[PDB]
Amino acid sequence: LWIARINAAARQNGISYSKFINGLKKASVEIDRKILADIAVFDKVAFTALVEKAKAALA
Amino acid sequence: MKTFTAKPETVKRDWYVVDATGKTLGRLATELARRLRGKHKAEYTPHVDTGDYIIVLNADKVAVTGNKRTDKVYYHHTGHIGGIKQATFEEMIARRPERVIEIAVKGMLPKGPLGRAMFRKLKVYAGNEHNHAAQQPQVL
Amino acid sequence: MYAVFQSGGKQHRVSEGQTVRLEKLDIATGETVEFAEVLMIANGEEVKIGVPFVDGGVIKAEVVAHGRGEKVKIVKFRRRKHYRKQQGHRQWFTDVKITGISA
RNA sequence: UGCUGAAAGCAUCUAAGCACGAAACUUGCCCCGAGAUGAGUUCUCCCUGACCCUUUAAGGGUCCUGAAGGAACGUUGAAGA
RNA sequence: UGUAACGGGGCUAAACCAUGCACCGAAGCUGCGGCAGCGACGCUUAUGCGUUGUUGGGUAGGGGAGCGUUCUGUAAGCCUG
RNA sequence: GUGAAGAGGGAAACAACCCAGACCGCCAGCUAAGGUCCCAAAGUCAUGGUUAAGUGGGAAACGAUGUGGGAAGGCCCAGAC
RNA sequence: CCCGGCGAGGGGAGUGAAAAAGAACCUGAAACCGUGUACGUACAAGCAGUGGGAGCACGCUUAGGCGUGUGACUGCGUACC
């Protein structure tokens, strides 16, 4: 239910939650995505840029 | 200060015209259930009490691809264990949308719990742009 | 202000809540110790560049104010199933939260 | 039961493709059927005067020469548990 | 005597094998409370509070401890129409 | 290997039989073997083959112009099918 | 005084502190029942559940997460000795 707002729209853009996490968890500062990422079901129009961060390395 | 989603009855029913009919069917008939619970609408109540409405289009083109389709019997024997028996195979039965080869939910909510009242909500007609027996507000 | 606190309370991430934590090993019913344990509390979660994450520490701190967890709340099961019959046994523990978020 | 014809210039219903086929499975055959509440409908037919209470789409509640009508209405009966 | 060998349903690769890799994930060791035994410490000492080690399922046995419908007493003593 | 006066997460639901493993709580983390598209709650992942049969949860005494990988060999363009 | 069957029982009167002391005489619960405030509700499985909670007869709050139980959804499980 929580992690749906980190796949339900991202899978289309290709950003599939567990294969995007072997990407995320290369950074030793980001680990606690498991619940707190729930902000995505209403922060949408500004959450939509958090993928751009490192896209030319992370992608 | 609760995180769960009661009731919800029903918020998200996704009025999608299942162009998947035949062409890739055995890849998404297996997922009609995980649709009516999830993979997009998983955002709400991804296990309990909800409702759903895809927009059906055809029936007898189940596709299914393999030696199965021409000796796999369907049985029911609905009375006193039936006695005398029934054996018409999956492409020869699929010639009618009926009770076991058309719904997929019969295979996927299999005891009846979660499924116990919203049985016909998908319409269970078939017939394309000759007969749209479904929704009048704009489908998808 | 936003608890950056985790230890057995990490739901408390919110500005208020009011959300529970532990009641620790020692003196935990004196109201306050008046100092603040943290300063890396948030940045993005209150400014015009949002992220769900702790990239800064915006000059606000969290007070040490354990409160008054005194009146012994509901906790305690027993034991049966085969002859595993106990009806006392259950040494006490509980949860609490911080006094009032003045910031 | 063979058709053209190869696998393997042979031989050949089969391998691609063809065509019929019998208590059989299928079928508006016999016989009840959504009482299959998945709860869909056709056809033929029938009822449209005035208002009230507020926690309002929830209603709950009135008051129309009384209309054609209905089970009791007197014996019963063809079914009479 | 209803097809009844993954629980289903048989998925032409989702698979089988081989190389990578991230989530799920009993009670399972972690957050962090609480603490019955047997030991070791700071020291106290009638003896104990916390630290530190081993570790906390418990019908045959020995150890060791809690409370009562009231009888026999604390007690013309304090309590009650 | 601690079995019932042990209760149920192993290996199929063969409470005993692998063996250390549950006191007691959480809207707090997750360890192993099973898997991991599913009724089921995470990649239709990236990097390398084989298989094109429904193979996979039915083998033994044999067979067999269906093919697959490897390395040595036999006949051969003064002409081996 | 009143009522019916020139009856039973009641409804007030009243000796009474009392008729929950009324002559089927004990200041008084246990097996089972009659009408009601609300339910779940004539598609039922699986010791009739504690959960996790949606809003319902009702009763608080200048709003403030509740003081109430049949228990839509369904999760867990087989309470014995």
Curated annotation (Swiss-Prot), chain A:
Give a GO biological-process term: cytoplasmic translation
Does Cytoplasm appear among the keywords? no
Keywords in alphabetical order:
Ribonucleoprotein, Ribosomal protein, RNA-binding, rRNA-binding
Spans traversing the lipid bilayer: none
Q: Which GO terms describe its cellular component?
A: cytoplasm; cytosol; cytosolic large ribosomal subunit
Give the GO molecular function terms. large ribosomal subunit rRNA binding; mRNA binding; mRNA regulatory element binding translation repressor activity; structural constituent of ribosome
Question: Whom does it interact with, and what assembly results?
Answer: Part of the 50S ribosomal subunit. Contacts L21.
What family does the Swiss-Prot or TrEMBL record give for this protein?
Belongs to the bacterial ribosomal protein bL20 family.
Q: What does this protein do?
A: One of the primary rRNA binding proteins, it binds close to the 5'-end of the 23S rRNA. It is important during the early stages of 50S assembly.
Protein name per UniProt? Large ribosomal subunit protein bL20
UniProtKB/Swiss-Prot annotation, chain B:
Which HAMAP family does the annotation name? Ribosomal_uL13
An example of a GO molecular function for this protein is: zinc ion binding
- Record-linked Pfam families: Ribosomal_L13
Query: Which top-level group of life is the source organism from?
Result: Bacteria
InterPro entries given in the database record: Ribosomal_uL13 (IPR005822), Ribosomal_uL13_bac-type (IPR005823), Ribosomal_uL13_CS (IPR023563), Ribosomal_uL13_sf (IPR036899)
The task this protein performs is described as:
This protein is one of the early assembly proteins of the 50S ribosomal subunit, although it is not seen to bind rRNA by itself. It is important during the early stages of 50S assembly.
Q: What is this protein called?
A: Large ribosomal subunit protein uL13
GO terms in the biological process aspect are: cytoplasmic translation; negative regulation of translation
Annotated keywords: Ribonucleoprotein, Ribosomal protein
User: What protein family is recorded?
Assistant: Belongs to the universal ribosomal protein uL13 family.
Q: What's a single GO CC term here? A: cytoplasm
Q: How does it assemble?
A: Part of the 50S ribosomal subunit.
Q: Which organism is it from?
A: Escherichia coli (strain K12)
Curated annotation (Swiss-Prot), chain C:
Under HAMAP family, the record lists: Ribosomal_bL21
Q: Name one GO cellular component term.
A: cytosol
Q: Does the keyword Ribosomal protein apply?
A: yes
Protein family according to the UniProt entry = Belongs to the bacterial ribosomal protein bL21 family.
Question: InterPro entries annotated for this entry?
Answer: bL21-like (IPR028909), bL21-like_sf (IPR036164), Ribosomal_bL21 (IPR001787), Ribosomal_bL21_CS (IPR018258)
Q: Name one GO molecular function term.
A: structural constituent of ribosome
Organism's domain of life? Bacteria
An example GO BP is:
cytoplasmic translation
Q: Which SUPFAM superfamilies match?
A: L21p-like (SSF141091)
Q: Which UniProt keywords apply?
A: Ribonucleoprotein, Ribosomal protein, RNA-binding, rRNA-binding
Quaternary context: Part of the 50S ribosomal subunit. Contacts protein L20.
Say what the protein does: This protein binds to 23S rRNA in the presence of protein L20.
Protein name according to UniProt: Large ribosomal subunit protein bL21
